[PDB]
Design brief:
Chain lengths: ~250, ~250
Amino acid sequence: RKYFVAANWKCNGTLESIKSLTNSFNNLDFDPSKLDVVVFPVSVHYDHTRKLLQSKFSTGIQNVSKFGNGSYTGEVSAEIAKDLNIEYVIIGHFERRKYFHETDEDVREKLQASLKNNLKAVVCFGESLEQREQNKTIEVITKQVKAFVDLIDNFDNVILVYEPLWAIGTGKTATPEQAQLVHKEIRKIVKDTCGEKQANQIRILYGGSVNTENCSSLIQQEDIDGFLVGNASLKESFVDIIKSAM
Amino acid sequence: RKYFVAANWKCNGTLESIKSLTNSFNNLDFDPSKLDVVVFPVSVHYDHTRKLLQSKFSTGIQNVSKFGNGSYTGEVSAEIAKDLNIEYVIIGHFERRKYFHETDEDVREKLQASLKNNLKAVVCFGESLEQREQNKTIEVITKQVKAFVDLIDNFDNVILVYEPLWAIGTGKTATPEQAQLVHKEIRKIVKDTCGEKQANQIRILYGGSVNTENCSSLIQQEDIDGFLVGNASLKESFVDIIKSAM
């Protein structure tokens, strides 16, 4: 299966910084038919970003509505994204589950809406420290995946992402090996619920803290197909993280 | 006080529909130094819309974050809007209060962030059918306005909007006199908390169902200084609604 490296800029950037950053990314020589590289800018920065980034890179938005077009002030629907030729959408990021109040039900409705409009989706999930310390990681992940897994029609169009919440901000570090065990378990749930062929083609990205020093060890694990990068994707050195997967 | 007519497109539009619409809007000749006309397109359409509309039209976005730049996937901060020269932001729309659990506290935080970054704000509030039937209209409104009016101001930069939630899809209808009775009460609250000179300069818009048939009767009322139009703003005839305020 193809490796997938994504840059989640979150709520950051100005017109100038974005200009300089995309200028550095464009200096990288790679083949877009082998590797998938996607940049996710702030909604109001989309046109500016698409224009500056060469065609080798794909682009997407950080959130999509669970409703369609209509009376929902502040929302961007799947149909609007499709008309704009937007290719990817992030769904279920922990910051949205935490700060805003998105549930597994919201996740499934957003996925259903994206697929219904022929959009590609990157869906996030993961367990917290409290759930981990009491040995419930697998029970939590099974519940989270089971919420939307039956909607997946084309296993090349939905990318899964495991966010180790127990490590994020807690002052703890998730080793590649610890990550690999979870990814292995996730692939097994997809196999048992959907099928072997289906489990073999779907990408499962890391999603924890990735930098230039640990990217190689992570990508080497057999069930880790790439990453959704945060803070490091706002730096010019992000090119070295891409290089680790080619 | 200068009249203020705003078009809230909500979650609607395509690249092509926006092109046709902005074309018809551009036929209208008005003097922006006498009348404020603002359009609020979906975030990913903002650039496309701003370039299509002539400078006499102002533009803005339908929601801003209460947080700043950082790890808030999916959000747009006041600082980012400022860098883009976005002039207005909508805050507190009932759809966001209903479907996205936004509270009075959130409204206060977002207004503070916007004024801090030199953005003009359009703040919405209103009572429901149940609150109205229990004769709680004045008490509810008083509390909602007091949540943010709190010495955070320059009275030309903040526009208040009254949304009669009790008439939005309830089968009930608000008459221009019923709308005027509430606007009068709202202006009094600004008078009791900020002063008469301040109360007399601030705009208060009507955010109920506005169409070509009732616009003139509504704008004629003493304390109604304009509107925040919904579905009617997505039609060519919207210009006739702008003319009623000339």
